Coordinates of C-alpha atoms and ligand atoms in Angstrom, one line a residue:
Chain A
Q1 CA -21.0 -36.8 -49.7
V2 CA -20.5 -37.8 -46.0
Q3 CA -23.7 -37.2 -44.1
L4 CA -25.1 -37.7 -40.6
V5 CA -29.0 -37.8 -40.5
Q6 CA -30.6 -38.0 -37.1
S7 CA -34.1 -39.1 -35.9
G8 CA -37.1 -36.8 -35.5
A9 CA -38.2 -34.5 -32.7
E10 CA -39.1 -35.9 -29.3
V11 CA -41.4 -34.7 -26.5
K12 CA -41.1 -36.5 -23.2
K13 CA -42.3 -36.2 -19.6
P14 CA -39.6 -35.9 -16.8
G15 CA -38.2 -39.2 -15.6
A16 CA -38.7 -40.8 -19.0
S17 CA -36.0 -41.5 -21.5
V18 CA -35.0 -40.7 -25.1
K19 CA -33.0 -42.8 -27.5
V20 CA -32.1 -40.3 -30.2
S21 CA -30.4 -41.9 -33.2
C22 CA -28.0 -40.7 -35.9
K23 CA -27.4 -42.5 -39.2
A24 CA -24.1 -42.2 -41.0
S25 CA -23.4 -42.4 -44.8
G26 CA -20.7 -41.6 -47.4
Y27 CA -18.0 -43.4 -45.4
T28 CA -17.1 -46.5 -43.4
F29 CA -19.1 -46.1 -40.1
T30 CA -16.7 -48.0 -37.9
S31 CA -13.5 -46.1 -39.0
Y32 CA -14.4 -42.9 -37.1
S33 CA -15.6 -42.2 -33.6
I34 CA -18.7 -40.0 -32.9
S35 CA -19.6 -37.7 -30.1
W36 CA -22.7 -35.8 -29.0
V37 CA -23.0 -32.1 -28.5
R38 CA -26.2 -30.6 -26.9
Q39 CA -27.6 -27.1 -27.1
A40 CA -30.4 -25.8 -24.9
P41 CA -32.6 -23.1 -26.5
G42 CA -30.7 -19.8 -26.9
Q43 CA -27.5 -21.2 -25.3
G44 CA -24.1 -22.6 -26.2
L45 CA -23.0 -26.0 -27.3
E46 CA -22.3 -28.6 -24.6
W47 CA -20.2 -31.7 -25.2
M48 CA -21.7 -34.9 -23.6
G49 CA -19.4 -37.8 -24.5
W50 CA -17.7 -39.8 -27.2
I51 CA -17.9 -43.3 -28.6
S52 CA -15.4 -45.4 -30.6
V53 CA -17.8 -46.8 -33.3
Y54 CA -15.2 -49.4 -33.9
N55 CA -14.4 -50.8 -30.4
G56 CA -17.3 -49.4 -28.3
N57 CA -15.2 -47.4 -25.9
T58 CA -16.9 -44.4 -24.3
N59 CA -15.9 -41.1 -22.5
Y60 CA -18.6 -38.9 -20.8
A61 CA -19.0 -35.5 -19.3
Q62 CA -19.4 -36.0 -15.6
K63 CA -22.7 -34.2 -15.8
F64 CA -24.2 -37.2 -17.6
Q65 CA -22.1 -40.1 -16.4
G66 CA -24.2 -43.1 -15.6
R67 CA -27.4 -41.4 -16.8
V68 CA -26.6 -41.6 -20.6
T69 CA -25.4 -44.5 -22.6
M70 CA -24.1 -44.1 -26.1
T71 CA -24.1 -47.1 -28.4
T72 CA -23.8 -47.9 -32.1
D73 CA -25.0 -50.4 -34.6
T74 CA -22.5 -51.3 -37.3
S75 CA -25.0 -53.2 -39.5
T76 CA -27.2 -50.1 -39.8
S77 CA -24.4 -47.5 -39.4
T78 CA -26.4 -45.8 -36.7
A79 CA -25.1 -44.3 -33.5
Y80 CA -27.6 -44.0 -30.7
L81 CA -27.7 -41.8 -27.6
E82 CA -29.9 -42.9 -24.6
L83 CA -30.8 -40.3 -22.0
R84 CA -32.5 -41.5 -18.9
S85 CA -34.4 -40.0 -16.0
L86 CA -35.0 -36.9 -18.2
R87 CA -35.3 -33.4 -16.7
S88 CA -37.0 -30.2 -17.9
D89 CA -33.6 -28.8 -18.6
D90 CA -32.6 -31.6 -21.0
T91 CA -34.8 -29.6 -23.4
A92 CA -32.2 -29.0 -26.1
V93 CA -31.2 -29.8 -29.7
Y94 CA -28.9 -32.8 -29.5
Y95 CA -26.2 -33.2 -32.2
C96 CA -24.1 -36.1 -33.3
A97 CA -20.7 -35.0 -34.5
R98 CA -18.0 -37.1 -36.2
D99 CA -14.2 -37.2 -35.4
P100 CA -11.8 -35.9 -36.3
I101 CA -12.6 -32.3 -35.6
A102 CA -11.0 -31.3 -38.9
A103 CA -13.6 -33.4 -40.7
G104 CA -16.3 -30.8 -39.9
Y105 CA -19.0 -33.5 -40.1
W106 CA -22.1 -32.9 -38.0
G107 CA -25.8 -34.0 -38.1
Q108 CA -28.9 -31.8 -38.5
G109 CA -29.7 -32.3 -34.8
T110 CA -32.6 -33.9 -32.9
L111 CA -34.8 -31.7 -30.7
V112 CA -35.9 -33.3 -27.4
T113 CA -38.4 -31.4 -25.3
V114 CA -38.7 -32.7 -21.7
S115 CA -41.7 -31.2 -19.8
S116 CA -44.5 -32.1 -17.5
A117 CA -46.8 -30.0 -19.7
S118 CA -49.4 -32.1 -21.6
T119 CA -50.1 -31.8 -25.3
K120 CA -52.5 -28.8 -25.8
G121 CA -53.8 -26.6 -28.6
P122 CA -53.5 -22.8 -28.5
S123 CA -56.2 -20.2 -28.0
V124 CA -56.0 -17.7 -30.9
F125 CA -57.1 -14.2 -29.9
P126 CA -57.2 -11.4 -32.4
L127 CA -55.0 -8.4 -31.9
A128 CA -57.5 -5.9 -33.3
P129 CA -56.3 -3.0 -35.4
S130 CA -57.2 0.5 -34.0
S131 CA -56.0 4.1 -34.1
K132 CA -53.6 2.8 -31.3
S133 CA -52.0 0.5 -33.9
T134 CA -52.2 2.9 -37.0
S135 CA -49.4 5.1 -38.3
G136 CA -50.1 7.3 -41.3
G137 CA -51.5 5.1 -44.1
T138 CA -50.7 1.7 -42.7
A139 CA -51.9 -0.2 -39.6
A140 CA -50.8 -3.4 -37.8
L141 CA -53.1 -6.2 -36.7
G142 CA -52.4 -9.8 -35.5
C143 CA -53.1 -13.0 -33.7
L144 CA -52.0 -14.0 -30.2
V145 CA -51.4 -17.8 -30.2
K146 CA -51.5 -18.5 -26.4
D147 CA -50.9 -21.5 -24.1
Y148 CA -50.0 -24.4 -26.4
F149 CA -47.7 -27.4 -26.0
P150 CA -45.5 -28.6 -27.6
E151 CA -43.8 -26.7 -30.4
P152 CA -44.3 -25.8 -33.2
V153 CA -47.4 -23.9 -34.3
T154 CA -47.5 -22.9 -37.9
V155 CA -49.3 -19.6 -38.7
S156 CA -50.4 -18.2 -42.1
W157 CA -52.5 -15.3 -43.3
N158 CA -55.6 -15.2 -45.4
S159 CA -55.1 -18.9 -46.1
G160 CA -51.6 -18.1 -47.3
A161 CA -52.5 -15.5 -49.9
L162 CA -51.6 -11.9 -48.8
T163 CA -48.5 -12.5 -46.6
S164 CA -45.4 -10.4 -47.7
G165 CA -45.8 -7.9 -44.9
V166 CA -46.0 -10.4 -42.0
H167 CA -43.7 -10.8 -39.0
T168 CA -44.3 -13.9 -36.8
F169 CA -42.5 -13.7 -33.4
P170 CA -40.5 -16.6 -32.0
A171 CA -42.3 -18.6 -29.3
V172 CA -41.8 -18.0 -25.6
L173 CA -41.9 -20.7 -23.0
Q174 CA -44.2 -19.3 -20.3
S175 CA -43.3 -20.0 -16.7
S176 CA -46.5 -22.0 -16.6
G177 CA -45.0 -24.5 -19.0
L178 CA -47.0 -23.8 -22.1
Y179 CA -45.6 -21.9 -25.1
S180 CA -47.0 -18.7 -26.6
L181 CA -46.5 -16.6 -29.7
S182 CA -47.9 -13.6 -31.7
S183 CA -48.1 -13.0 -35.4
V184 CA -48.4 -9.4 -36.5
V185 CA -49.1 -8.2 -40.1
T186 CA -48.9 -4.5 -41.2
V187 CA -51.3 -3.6 -44.0
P188 CA -52.6 -0.4 -45.6
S189 CA -55.0 1.1 -43.1
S190 CA -57.8 2.2 -45.5
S191 CA -58.0 -1.5 -46.5
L192 CA -59.4 -2.2 -43.0
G193 CA -62.8 -1.5 -44.6
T194 CA -62.8 -4.1 -47.4
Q195 CA -60.0 -6.6 -46.9
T196 CA -61.0 -9.3 -44.4
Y197 CA -58.0 -10.5 -42.4
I198 CA -58.0 -14.1 -41.2
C199 CA -55.0 -15.8 -39.5
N200 CA -54.7 -19.5 -39.8
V201 CA -53.0 -21.2 -36.8
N202 CA -52.3 -24.9 -37.3
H203 CA -50.9 -26.9 -34.4
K204 CA -50.5 -30.5 -35.6
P205 CA -49.5 -32.2 -32.3
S206 CA -52.9 -31.3 -30.8
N207 CA -54.6 -31.9 -34.1
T208 CA -55.6 -28.2 -34.0
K209 CA -56.4 -25.9 -36.8
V210 CA -58.0 -22.6 -35.8
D211 CA -59.0 -19.8 -38.2
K212 CA -59.5 -16.4 -36.7
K213 CA -60.7 -13.2 -38.3
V214 CA -59.2 -10.0 -36.9
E215 CA -61.8 -7.2 -36.9
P216 CA -60.9 -3.5 -36.5
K217 CA -62.0 -1.2 -33.7
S218 CA -60.7 2.4 -33.4
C219 CA -60.2 4.0 -29.9
Chain B
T1 CA -9.7 -46.3 -33.2
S2 CA -10.1 -46.8 -29.4
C3 CA -6.4 -46.1 -28.4
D4 CA -6.2 -49.6 -27.1
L5 CA -2.7 -49.9 -28.5
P6 CA -1.1 -46.5 -28.1
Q7 CA 2.2 -47.5 -29.9
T8 CA 0.2 -47.9 -33.1
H9 CA -1.4 -44.5 -32.9
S10 CA 1.6 -42.2 -32.1
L11 CA 3.2 -43.4 -35.4
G12 CA 2.3 -42.2 -38.9
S13 CA 0.6 -44.7 -41.2
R14 CA 2.3 -46.5 -44.1
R15 CA -0.8 -46.1 -46.3
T16 CA -0.1 -42.3 -46.2
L17 CA 3.2 -42.6 -47.9
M18 CA 1.7 -45.1 -50.3
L19 CA -1.0 -42.8 -51.4
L20 CA 1.4 -39.9 -51.8
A21 CA 3.4 -42.2 -54.0
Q22 CA 0.5 -42.9 -56.3
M23 CA -0.4 -39.2 -56.5
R24 CA 2.8 -38.5 -58.6
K25 CA 2.3 -37.4 -62.2
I26 CA 5.4 -35.8 -63.7
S27 CA 8.8 -37.5 -63.0
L28 CA 11.0 -36.5 -59.9
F29 CA 14.3 -35.9 -61.8
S30 CA 12.3 -33.9 -64.4
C31 CA 12.3 -31.0 -61.9
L32 CA 16.1 -30.2 -62.0
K33 CA 17.0 -27.3 -59.7
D34 CA 13.4 -26.2 -59.3
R35 CA 13.5 -27.1 -55.6
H36 CA 14.1 -25.6 -52.2
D37 CA 15.7 -26.9 -49.0
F38 CA 12.5 -26.6 -46.9
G39 CA 14.4 -27.1 -43.6
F40 CA 12.1 -29.6 -42.0
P41 CA 12.7 -29.9 -38.3
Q42 CA 13.4 -33.6 -37.8
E43 CA 14.3 -32.9 -34.2
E44 CA 10.5 -32.9 -33.6
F45 CA 9.9 -36.5 -34.1
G46 CA 11.0 -40.1 -34.2
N47 CA 12.6 -40.1 -30.7
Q48 CA 12.4 -43.8 -29.9
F49 CA 10.6 -43.2 -26.7
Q50 CA 8.7 -40.2 -25.3
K51 CA 6.1 -40.6 -28.0
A52 CA 4.0 -39.0 -25.3
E53 CA 5.5 -35.6 -26.2
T54 CA 4.9 -36.5 -29.8
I55 CA 1.1 -37.0 -30.2
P56 CA 0.3 -33.3 -30.7
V57 CA 3.3 -32.7 -33.0
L58 CA 2.1 -35.5 -35.2
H59 CA -1.5 -34.2 -34.9
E60 CA -0.6 -30.7 -36.2
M61 CA 1.7 -32.1 -39.0
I62 CA -1.3 -34.1 -40.3
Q63 CA -3.7 -31.3 -39.8
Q64 CA -1.1 -29.3 -41.9
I65 CA -0.7 -31.9 -44.7
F66 CA -4.5 -31.9 -44.9
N67 CA -4.9 -28.2 -45.1
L68 CA -2.1 -28.0 -47.8
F69 CA -3.7 -30.7 -49.9
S70 CA -7.3 -29.4 -49.3
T71 CA -6.9 -26.1 -51.1
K72 CA -8.5 -25.3 -54.5
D73 CA -4.9 -25.4 -55.8
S74 CA -4.3 -28.9 -54.5
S75 CA -7.6 -30.0 -56.0
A76 CA -6.4 -28.6 -59.4
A77 CA -2.9 -30.1 -59.0
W78 CA -3.8 -33.7 -58.1
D79 CA -6.2 -36.5 -59.0
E80 CA -9.7 -36.2 -57.4
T81 CA -9.9 -39.9 -56.4
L82 CA -6.5 -40.2 -54.8
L83 CA -7.0 -37.0 -52.8
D84 CA -10.3 -38.5 -51.4
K85 CA -8.3 -41.6 -50.4
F86 CA -5.6 -39.3 -49.0
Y87 CA -8.0 -37.3 -46.8
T88 CA -9.5 -40.5 -45.5
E89 CA -6.2 -41.8 -44.4
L90 CA -5.2 -38.4 -42.9
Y91 CA -8.6 -38.2 -41.2
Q92 CA -8.0 -41.6 -39.8
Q93 CA -4.8 -40.7 -38.0
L94 CA -6.3 -37.5 -36.5
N95 CA -9.3 -39.6 -35.4
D96 CA -6.9 -42.1 -33.8
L97 CA -4.6 -39.5 -32.1
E98 CA -7.7 -37.7 -30.8
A99 CA -9.0 -41.0 -29.4
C100 CA -6.0 -41.4 -27.2
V101 CA -6.2 -37.9 -25.9
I102 CA -9.9 -38.2 -25.2
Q103 CA -9.2 -41.2 -23.0
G104 CA -6.2 -39.7 -21.1
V105 CA -3.4 -41.2 -23.3
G106 CA -0.8 -38.7 -24.5
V107 CA -2.4 -35.7 -22.9
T108 CA 0.1 -32.8 -23.0
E109 CA 0.5 -31.3 -19.5
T110 CA 3.8 -29.4 -19.9
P111 CA 4.3 -25.7 -19.5
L112 CA 4.9 -24.9 -23.2
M113 CA 2.1 -27.4 -24.2
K114 CA 4.6 -28.4 -26.9
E115 CA 3.9 -25.2 -28.7
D116 CA 7.5 -24.4 -29.7
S117 CA 7.5 -27.7 -31.5
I118 CA 4.2 -27.0 -33.2
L119 CA 5.4 -23.6 -34.3
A120 CA 8.3 -25.4 -35.9
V121 CA 6.2 -27.6 -38.0
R122 CA 4.0 -24.6 -38.8
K123 CA 6.9 -22.5 -40.1
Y124 CA 7.9 -25.5 -42.2
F125 CA 4.5 -25.5 -43.9
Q126 CA 4.3 -21.6 -44.3
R127 CA 7.5 -22.1 -46.4
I128 CA 6.0 -24.9 -48.4
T129 CA 3.0 -22.6 -49.1
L130 CA 5.3 -19.6 -49.9
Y131 CA 7.1 -21.8 -52.4
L132 CA 4.0 -22.8 -54.3
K133 CA 2.9 -19.2 -54.4
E134 CA 6.3 -18.0 -55.5
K135 CA 6.4 -20.7 -58.2
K136 CA 2.9 -19.9 -59.4
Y137 CA 1.9 -23.5 -58.4
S138 CA 3.7 -25.1 -61.4
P139 CA 3.6 -28.9 -61.9
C140 CA 7.3 -29.0 -60.8
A141 CA 6.7 -26.9 -57.7
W142 CA 4.0 -29.3 -56.7
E143 CA 6.1 -32.4 -57.5
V144 CA 8.9 -31.1 -55.3
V145 CA 6.3 -30.4 -52.5
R146 CA 4.7 -33.9 -52.9
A147 CA 8.1 -35.6 -52.7
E148 CA 9.1 -33.3 -49.8
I149 CA 6.0 -34.0 -47.6
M150 CA 6.5 -37.7 -48.3
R151 CA 10.1 -37.5 -47.1
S152 CA 9.0 -35.3 -44.2
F153 CA 6.1 -37.4 -43.0
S154 CA 8.2 -40.6 -43.2
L155 CA 10.2 -39.4 -40.2
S156 CA 6.9 -39.7 -38.2
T157 CA 6.6 -43.4 -39.1
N158 CA 8.0 -46.9 -38.7
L159 CA 10.5 -46.7 -41.6
Chain C
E1 CA -12.0 -28.6 -16.8
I2 CA -10.7 -26.0 -19.2
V3 CA -13.3 -23.2 -19.4
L4 CA -13.1 -21.2 -22.7
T5 CA -14.4 -17.7 -22.2
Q6 CA -15.2 -15.8 -25.4
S7 CA -15.2 -12.1 -25.9
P8 CA -16.9 -9.9 -26.7
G9 CA -20.4 -11.3 -26.1
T10 CA -21.7 -9.3 -29.1
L11 CA -19.6 -7.6 -31.8
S12 CA -21.4 -5.0 -33.8
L13 CA -19.7 -4.1 -37.1
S14 CA -20.9 -3.0 -40.5
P15 CA -19.9 -5.1 -43.6
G16 CA -16.4 -4.4 -44.9
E17 CA -15.2 -3.9 -41.3
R18 CA -12.8 -6.2 -39.4
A19 CA -14.0 -8.6 -36.8
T20 CA -11.7 -9.9 -34.0
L21 CA -13.2 -12.7 -31.9
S22 CA -11.3 -13.7 -28.8
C23 CA -11.2 -17.1 -27.0
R24 CA -9.5 -17.6 -23.6
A25 CA -8.8 -20.9 -21.9
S26 CA -8.8 -21.3 -18.2
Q27 CA -5.5 -23.0 -18.8
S28 CA -3.1 -23.6 -21.7
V29 CA -4.2 -25.6 -24.7
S30 CA -1.9 -26.8 -27.5
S31 CA -2.9 -24.7 -30.5
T32 CA -3.3 -28.0 -32.4
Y33 CA -6.4 -28.8 -30.4
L34 CA -8.4 -25.5 -30.9
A35 CA -11.2 -25.0 -33.4
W36 CA -13.7 -22.4 -34.4
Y37 CA -17.3 -22.8 -35.5
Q38 CA -20.0 -20.6 -37.0
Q39 CA -23.6 -21.2 -36.3
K40 CA -26.7 -19.5 -37.9
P41 CA -30.3 -19.8 -36.7
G42 CA -31.8 -23.3 -37.0
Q43 CA -28.6 -24.9 -38.2
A44 CA -25.8 -27.2 -36.9
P45 CA -22.4 -25.6 -36.1
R46 CA -20.0 -25.3 -39.0
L47 CA -16.3 -25.7 -38.7
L48 CA -14.4 -22.6 -39.8
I49 CA -10.9 -23.3 -38.5
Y50 CA -9.1 -26.4 -37.1
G51 CA -5.8 -26.8 -35.3
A52 CA -6.0 -23.1 -34.6
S53 CA -5.4 -21.6 -38.0
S54 CA -6.2 -23.9 -40.7
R55 CA -9.3 -23.1 -42.8
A56 CA -11.9 -25.9 -43.4
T57 CA -12.8 -26.6 -47.0
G58 CA -15.2 -24.0 -48.5
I59 CA -14.2 -21.5 -45.8
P60 CA -12.9 -18.3 -47.6
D61 CA -9.5 -16.6 -47.3
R62 CA -10.9 -13.6 -45.3
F63 CA -11.1 -16.0 -42.3
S64 CA -7.9 -16.4 -40.3
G65 CA -7.1 -17.7 -36.8
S66 CA -4.2 -17.5 -34.4
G67 CA -3.2 -18.0 -30.8
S68 CA -1.5 -20.3 -28.2
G69 CA -1.2 -20.8 -24.5
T70 CA -4.5 -19.4 -23.1
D71 CA -5.3 -16.8 -25.8
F72 CA -6.7 -17.4 -29.3
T73 CA -8.2 -15.2 -32.0
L74 CA -10.5 -15.5 -35.1
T75 CA -10.2 -12.6 -37.5
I76 CA -12.6 -11.9 -40.3
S77 CA -10.6 -9.5 -42.4
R78 CA -13.5 -8.0 -44.4
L79 CA -17.0 -8.8 -43.1
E80 CA -19.5 -9.9 -45.8
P81 CA -23.3 -10.1 -45.0
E82 CA -22.9 -13.9 -45.2
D83 CA -20.8 -13.9 -42.1
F84 CA -23.0 -12.3 -39.4
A85 CA -23.5 -15.2 -37.1
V86 CA -22.7 -16.7 -33.7
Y87 CA -19.1 -17.9 -33.4
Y88 CA -17.8 -20.6 -31.0
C89 CA -14.3 -21.8 -30.2
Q90 CA -13.6 -25.4 -29.1
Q91 CA -10.7 -27.1 -27.4
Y92 CA -10.3 -30.8 -28.0
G93 CA -7.0 -32.0 -26.4
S94 CA -8.6 -33.1 -23.2
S95 CA -11.2 -35.0 -21.2
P96 CA -14.4 -33.2 -21.6
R97 CA -14.2 -31.2 -24.8
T98 CA -15.4 -27.7 -24.1
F99 CA -16.8 -24.8 -26.1
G100 CA -16.7 -21.0 -25.6
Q101 CA -20.1 -19.4 -24.7
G102 CA -20.0 -17.7 -28.2
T103 CA -19.9 -14.3 -29.7
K104 CA -22.8 -12.8 -31.8
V105 CA -21.5 -10.8 -34.7
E106 CA -24.4 -8.7 -35.7
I107 CA -24.8 -6.1 -38.4
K108 CA -24.2 -2.5 -37.2
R109 CA -26.4 0.0 -39.0
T110 CA -27.7 3.5 -38.4
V111 CA -29.7 4.0 -35.3
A112 CA -33.4 3.5 -36.0
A113 CA -36.3 4.6 -33.6
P114 CA -39.1 2.0 -33.1
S115 CA -42.7 2.3 -34.2
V116 CA -44.7 1.4 -31.1
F117 CA -48.2 -0.1 -31.1
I118 CA -50.5 -1.4 -28.4
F119 CA -53.4 -3.9 -28.7
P120 CA -56.1 -4.4 -26.1
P121 CA -57.4 -7.8 -25.0
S122 CA -60.1 -9.5 -27.1
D123 CA -63.6 -10.2 -25.8
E124 CA -63.0 -13.9 -26.4
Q125 CA -60.0 -14.0 -23.9
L126 CA -61.9 -11.7 -21.5
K127 CA -64.8 -14.2 -21.5
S128 CA -62.1 -16.9 -20.8
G129 CA -61.1 -14.8 -17.7
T130 CA -57.7 -13.4 -18.7
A131 CA -56.6 -10.1 -20.2
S132 CA -53.4 -10.1 -22.3
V133 CA -52.3 -6.7 -23.6
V134 CA -49.8 -6.8 -26.4
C135 CA -47.3 -4.0 -27.2
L136 CA -45.3 -4.0 -30.5
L137 CA -42.1 -2.3 -31.3
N138 CA -41.6 -2.4 -35.1
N139 CA -38.3 -2.2 -37.0
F140 CA -35.6 -0.7 -34.6
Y141 CA -31.9 -0.5 -34.0
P142 CA -29.9 -1.0 -31.8
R143 CA -31.4 -4.1 -30.2
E144 CA -31.4 -2.5 -26.8
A145 CA -34.9 -1.2 -26.0
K146 CA -36.9 -0.8 -22.7
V147 CA -40.6 -1.6 -22.6
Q148 CA -42.4 -0.7 -19.4
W149 CA -45.9 -1.6 -18.7
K150 CA -47.9 0.8 -16.6
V151 CA -51.3 -0.1 -15.1
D152 CA -52.7 3.3 -13.8
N153 CA -49.1 4.4 -13.5
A154 CA -48.1 1.4 -11.4
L155 CA -44.9 0.1 -12.9
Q156 CA -45.7 -3.5 -13.9
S157 CA -43.2 -6.3 -13.4
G158 CA -43.0 -10.1 -13.5
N159 CA -46.3 -10.3 -15.3
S160 CA -45.2 -9.9 -19.0
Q161 CA -42.9 -11.7 -21.4
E162 CA -41.3 -10.5 -24.7
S163 CA -39.6 -12.0 -27.7
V164 CA -37.4 -10.2 -30.2
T165 CA -37.0 -11.3 -33.8
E166 CA -33.7 -12.1 -35.4
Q167 CA -32.0 -9.1 -37.1
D168 CA -33.9 -8.7 -40.4
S169 CA -32.1 -9.8 -43.6
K170 CA -33.4 -6.7 -45.5
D171 CA -33.1 -3.6 -43.3
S172 CA -31.0 -5.1 -40.5
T173 CA -33.5 -4.0 -37.8
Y174 CA -35.2 -5.7 -34.9
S175 CA -38.8 -6.0 -33.6
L176 CA -40.2 -6.9 -30.2
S177 CA -43.5 -8.1 -28.7
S178 CA -44.1 -7.6 -25.0
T179 CA -47.3 -9.2 -23.7
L180 CA -48.7 -8.1 -20.3
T181 CA -51.2 -10.7 -18.9
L182 CA -53.6 -10.2 -16.0
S183 CA -56.6 -12.1 -14.7
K184 CA -60.0 -10.5 -15.7
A185 CA -60.5 -9.8 -12.0
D186 CA -57.2 -7.7 -11.9
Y187 CA -57.6 -6.1 -15.3
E188 CA -61.0 -4.8 -14.5
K189 CA -60.0 -3.2 -11.2
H190 CA -57.8 -0.7 -13.1
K191 CA -58.4 1.9 -15.9
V192 CA -55.4 3.1 -17.9
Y193 CA -53.0 0.6 -19.6
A194 CA -49.7 2.0 -21.0
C195 CA -46.8 0.6 -23.0
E196 CA -43.9 3.0 -22.5
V197 CA -41.1 2.3 -24.9
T198 CA -37.7 3.9 -24.5
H199 CA -34.8 3.4 -27.0
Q200 CA -31.6 5.1 -28.1
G201 CA -33.1 6.5 -31.3
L202 CA -35.9 8.4 -29.5
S203 CA -35.7 11.9 -28.0
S204 CA -38.1 11.0 -25.2
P205 CA -39.8 7.7 -24.3
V206 CA -42.8 6.9 -26.4
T207 CA -45.9 5.8 -24.5
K208 CA -48.8 4.1 -26.2
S209 CA -51.9 3.8 -24.0
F210 CA -55.7 3.1 -23.7
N211 CA -58.6 3.0 -21.3
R212 CA -61.0 0.1 -20.8
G213 CA -64.5 0.5 -22.2
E214 CA -63.0 3.1 -24.4
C215 CA -61.7 0.0 -26.1
Ligands
NI301 NI1 -34.6 -29.1 -14.2
NI302 NI1 -7.6 -46.2 -31.3
NI303 NI1 -54.0 -1.3 -7.9

């Protein structure tokens, strides 16, 4: 099987650089040229440039000309992409894709997160179940995971036991620069007596693991 | 592979015909009158010069050959290992043609965008397809097609 | 530069129906240099069609493509659930390769009114000096829903964010979480907090609301 496997996620401050990489296998590296498509969160694909793995020729989108260099290493069959003087809006999943188009070969993509926010763990506040969150035999409760950087937070319920009624919402980049996210679970409401509900929010980048009980209160 | 020699890239490879050769199984004269005149449009190619107009016509021809020989049927009809070598060669030429285009060599800028010529090649393959369907993809039907593409594709080359 | 403009932005069909995606180039492209991709959440693009018609390997017969000059079309003859995804076209006969802005093909299903819940702030956050109030719309269709925050009947604005889920794999519905955030100083200078949801499948807008101290 042909496969392109790229490097891990990156988080950088503005003005820094990234050298994302993309390793080829299943074919002769030098025989096909590679290009880089980029995709900001919730937006389209954007073609950046193209490199002849064989001869080292390059074409670039004007947008990035003279700020990005693409290079390759034949010995390690790895194509690189350097991106300098990084901006907040370089936040995007970067892909390496292989020619020819008919080949259909792409990589899993590398996520670069450019921001002037600093690594930070999230506050975890309980969304308390009340009458104002009940509805005839079941009630919703949750956890607000607020003001963390960077992504991702992982969130589980009752140390992962009772969990097949959960909905965790996709994070939102606050205007401040920190991310935020809520996890709601709907449970049988009479169970708000016995069943203790704890959400477990783990944010590994800030070494953070918070456990929060969500206690009821009916208005 | 970097379009640094465009004369190379606007031709079809010799390795292509060679692989098609090896792919044969049953004889050629075994399939007596089990063959069509597929009306390939030779007009669309081999003009000594003006191999500027040609790049996209060769591009779609190869994309076509690929699509024809990439079906579940083709996979049944032909050897797994030759087909993989075949796709690699076909892939190479597309990769090479696409190289020239991405660096402003052989970029079609004419009103029709050479589409009339493309449609021609396309109709030629819709018939090849219709033939294999009509002949329930028999060994013969396939051998006729294999020999036909080989003849066809040769017009795009140095021979 | 050759700007591909895709249409519609979102196509809403139920499985079995026929999709017709459109792609339109700011100028003519040779059909040989036009492709189509299908992307699903958290995944790389996936080539459907190359050279304008030709199906990639593994791509099923129900997928077809046509077009020339400036206009091009992908057609999914009989939509399976597998297929609901974002679709992009790409040209690749010229200097910057360009993509269309994409069309979401999402499952159309019967209209479904949302279940609305509101959650007050927690003491822990209040101590910290902020008040976040979370409203929750559970399991609704269509995706279009209006959530208005009302602090003592003042229409709130610019001081909340929301996130919608992806269309659910089981019941094809959506859910939403608007969060209104205020400083403790602001929050305390007002009494009634209301989350007023309004959505196609509701006869009148549903308000959920509470009063401080009373929570
Ligand atoms: Ni910026
Ligand atoms: Ni070349
Ligand atoms: Ni006021």
